[PDB]
Write a protein that binds this ligand. Structure first.
Ligand code: BR9
Length: 328
């Protein structure tokens, strides 16, 4: 056996970028126009990322609250990609609105201006959600994902911190498109994306020909953590250990079937840590503290998202048609 990995392509929206003019997806050729940041007054720091600083601000022209993301310009091509994707998706359902692109006159630092969302941190909100609330918000994220997938884009960083929820107004926004990328059938992508707990098995086994289905694995991780009140659901201490946490639930038999279907070469680092694990029933995770959030429908939907085989997972459109969402 010396044939290399078996190629794969998305089951939906496969050729959406192929049939569009290069302007749409060639972000390296996109010309960015930077406005004057003097129209925005910074109020408070909301967070600090690896390559950004996020601030709550006021637009002085209309006295409205906005969010200003000041980017550390470490990679210009990466800045061009995020802007192009945000402009392509601008106005889509539950997608954060890019309101402006500006630079401070003195620093010349690239900054993105977004609509403000009055978010409740997940570490305080998720404990208060009812069975209905989880169904409702999951449907809202699905509307965002089916939209961006239809637009030939994969988010590649779906996690609670990238889902802003204004619970009082039942408004949800999918944010931080900095890791997002255009889907091109047959393209080999960098596997060093998403946050450890939400990384799909495809990333962990170094299978580069992934697609939109990566976002469906991440969504499943969020769902499992919400219905079982276990944060994170798969608690790896590193990227290799992350796959072992997954294998302790999904079992090692189905993992070997996955890597055999795509002729994947498993890294030798997995040899002494993987072990042998039985497939666990989803009902094993039900306890007194979470049983009011779990149902046969919830478990059937979860089982259809958390599969090693990226091709076998529900697409966002199939997911929207699941019985779990008949009440929304
Ligand atoms: N933290 C935050 C980011 C964005 Br973008 C919009 N609203 C927020 N609350």
């Amino acid at each position: 056996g010396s044939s290399g990995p078996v190629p794969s392509r998305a089951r939906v929206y496969t050729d959406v970028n192929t049939h569009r003019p290069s302007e749409y997806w060639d972000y390296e050729s996109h010309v960015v126009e930077w406005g004057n940041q003097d129209d925005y007054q910074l109020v408070r720091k909301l967070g600090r990322g690896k390559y950004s600083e996020v601030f709550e601000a006021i637009n002085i022209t209309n006295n409205e609250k906005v969010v200003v993301k000041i980017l550390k310009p470490v990679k210009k091509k990466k800045i061009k990609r995020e802007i192009k994707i945000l402009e392509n998706l601008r106005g889509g359902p539950n997608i954060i609105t890019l309101a402006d692109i500006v630079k401070d006159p003195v620093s010349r630092t690239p900054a993105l201006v977004f609509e403000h969302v009055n978010n409740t941190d997940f570490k305080q909100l998720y404990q208060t959600l009812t069975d209905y609330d989880i169904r409702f918000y999951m449907y809202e994220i699905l509307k965002a994902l089916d939209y961006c997938h239809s637009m030939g884009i994969m988010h590649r960083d779906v996690k609670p911190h990238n889902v802003m929820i204004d619970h009082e107004h039942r408004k949800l926004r999918l944010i931080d498109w900095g890791l997002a990328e255009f889907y091109h059938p047959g393209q080999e992508y960098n596997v060093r994306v998403a946050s450890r707990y939400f990384k799909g098995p495809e990333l962990l086994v170094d299978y580069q020909m992934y697609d939109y289905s990566l976002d469906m694995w991440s969504l499943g991780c969020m769902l499992a953590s919400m219905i079982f009140r276990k944060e994170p659901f798969f608690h790896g201490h590193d990227n290799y250990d992350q796959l072992v946490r997954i294998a302790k639930v999904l079992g090692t038999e189905d993992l070997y079937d996955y890597i055999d279907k795509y002729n994947i070469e498993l890294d030798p680092r997995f040899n002494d840590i993987l072990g042998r694990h039985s497939r666990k029933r989803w009902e094993r995770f039900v306890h007194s503290e979470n049983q009011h959030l779990v149902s046969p429908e919830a478990l059937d939907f979860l089982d259809k998202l958390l599969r090693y085989d990226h091709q076998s997972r529900l697409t966002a459109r199939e997911a929207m048609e699941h019985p779990y969402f008949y009440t929304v």
